[PDB]
Ligand binder design. Structure first.
Ligand SMILES: *N1=C2C(=O)[N]C(=O)N=C2N([C][C]([O])[C]([O])[C]([O])[C]OP([O])(=O)OP([O])(=O)O[C][C]2O[C](N3[C]=NC4=C3N=[C]N=C4[N])[C]([O])[C]2[O])C2=[C]C([C])=C([C])[C]=C21
Ligand SMILES: *N1=C2C(=O)[N]C(=O)N=C2N([C][C]([O])[C]([O])[C]([O])[C]OP([O])(=O)OP([O])(=O)O[C][C]2O[C](N3[C]=NC4=C3N=[C]N=C4[N])[C]([O])[C]2[O])C2=[C]C([C])=C([C])[C]=C21
Lengths: 299, 289
């Protein structure tokens, strides 16, 4: 496609990586010749490999968020099969001596098929998770899914669940109002910049404004007394949040930093040694190749 | 950067000053109203005809003695007395060092109290401009003291580049301060102020939105189009009425934008200097852009 008289470069780049990755040969060679590279970013194909990765993180003083990967869920049957995978994860984490935290996307529980289905399946996950001390994060997907995601969060909180948190994205205009609307829930928040392609009508097109909004929302949340997980790799933002929290006397027990597994691992450890709570987000599952393709196909 | 050096360098020469005063009156009058109060009032009338309001700023040589402080205060009193009965919004700005702050806090407070006593009954609003970081604490002490004495038509300026500003803002909330928010104009070390323009801008937006959400009246004193556009978007999206905030610009800086925002129904003011000592102010205007 074209944008403003010139080829859409974002589109061109995405389409090339997707075409190249989809070629049977390059996939064959990535699986065979690039095993070490892949395992820096994805634990493995199995729950067993994920747990070993979490143990290896914990030995270095960094906590784990376990993220089950799966093919895009398109039928009720697939949503139930994915929930099954989530339940095995919850049951497997149950004994572990370290903090237990899983992440999931509501579309994988059939949100697009039925909001009622997603809620039913999610509630069954929380029923297992909460007595086991397993925290469940509802990852935030693209803008058309925000209202439903917030609805399901409020529903579960109102049914008595507390071991559940949400993600807010600093690139959306609507996020400050969402945050303010949610305050009576005293939500546990993960703050991210935002990973989806959104039109200028719903999201700041300017990286300076996305970054400014991230800092504004983080500081607002901190001053409101909310527990906030700063999910960012941006050194400017990390340095400012460290300075701000120290200046404001905000205890280390009231916030944390989160990084993708294998991204700035040296900084993950440094922040850990400085006394901050740090987690790495650890994907695992049979669908790692399409997943890594999409991460590459982004920026 | 090379343009700045050249300008500041050439500006100090007496033959250059003679040329500007005789041959570049149109340039001078873009940025300063003139040497006299009479000229400042005429400049304010001209702005008002375009729907833009005026902030009147008396310029004088740096105050170094009590006598000089009292002389400056007299200039401010004449301004206040002259603004009385003008039909349009009356707003003056002052720097506390010009009222002898560095000589004595007691002196600056006494001189300022007298100005506020003459100003309030005449409907003249008085802004305490914020100077460098070593003066912030005294400025806020004087502000709080006068608020507690019952003065209400006095406001303060906070600068987004200082680490201390958010705490200052939160500390001042019980006073319900009328605020002008600026980026900050002084050379401050990395220990006290964000070195990175991206962070100064981010803090400006953060403080502005905090202040609006707390229900404070805020004057956004900035010429930055990215910030102005974001503040317009935010206030609209949040349903903040145009009666609860304003934009302020230096006189002669983006005058078309001033008129445009006025036509869009925003409160807009231009900061208009006048007085004998206008020549160093003018040079900083030329050098800046
Ligand atoms: N899960 C979510 C989610 O639920 N919703 C969502 O929209 N996004 C999710 N994210 C992804 C984030 O939104 C975001 O895309 C990433 O975190 C990346 O943004 P970041 O790191 O804040 O800032 P940036 O891209 O502007 O990068 C600025 C600087 O950071 C450093 N950087 C970034 N990426 C790097 C890197 N350095 C080395 N390698 C890599 N790959 C650079 O210096 C760069 O200049 C999401 C994120 C996270 C962390 C979690 C736990 C969960 C979700
Ligand atoms: N009085 C105060 C005060 O009491 N204390 C104080 O420290 N500073 C005062 N200011 C000055 C401001 O702090 C500040 O220096 C100026 O307002 C300039 O900052 P601004 O305009 O927010 O942002 P910038 O310089 O980074 O510029 C960014 C963009 O803005 C546009 N711009 C800026 N300057 C321009 C210009 N466009 C044309 N011409 C000029 N000269 C550009 O697009 C640029 O990319 C102070 C300011 C004001 C307004 C008042 C009323 C009172 C005080």
């Amino acid at each position: 496609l074209y944008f403003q008289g010139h080829m859409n470069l974002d589109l061109a780049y995405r389409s090339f990586v997707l075409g190249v990755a989809g070629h049977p040969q390059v996939e064959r060679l990535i699986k065979h010749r690039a095993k070490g590279l892949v395992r820096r970013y994805v634990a493995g194909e199995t729950l067993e490999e994920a747990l070993k990765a979490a143990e290896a993180l914990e030995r270095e003083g960094v906590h784990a968020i376990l993220d089950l990967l799966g093919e895009m869920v398109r039928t009720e049957e697939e949503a139930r099969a994915f929930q099954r995978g989530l339940l095995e994860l919850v049951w497997a984490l149950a004994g572990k001596p370290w903090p237990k935290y899983i992440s999931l996307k509501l579309t994988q529980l059939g949100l697009d098929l039925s909001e009622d289905l997603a809620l039913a399946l999610l509630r069954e996950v929380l029923r297992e998770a909460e007595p086991r001390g397993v925290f469940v994060r509802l990852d935030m997907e693209d803008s058309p899914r925000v209202e439903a995601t917030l609805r399901l969060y409020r529903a579960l909180r109102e049914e008595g669940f507390s071991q559940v948190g949400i993600v807010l994205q600093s690139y959306l205009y609507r996020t400050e109002k969402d945050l303010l609307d949610l305050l009576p829930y005293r939500p546990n928040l993960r703050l991210v910049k935002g990973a989806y392609r959104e039109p200028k009508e719903v999201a700041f097109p300017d990286k300076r404004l996305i970054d400014a909004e991230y800092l504004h929302l983080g500081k607002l949340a901190l001053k409101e007394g909310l527990y906030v997980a700063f999910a960012t790799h941006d050194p400017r933002i990390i340095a400012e949040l460290k300075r701000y929290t120290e200046a404001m006397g905000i205890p280390r027990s009231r916030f944390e930093f989160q990084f993708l597994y294998g991204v700035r691992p040296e900084e993950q450890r440094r922040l850990a040694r400085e006394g901050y709570t740090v987690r790495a987000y650890v994907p695992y599952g049979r669908d790692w190749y399409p997943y890594l393709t999409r991460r590459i196909a982004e920026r």
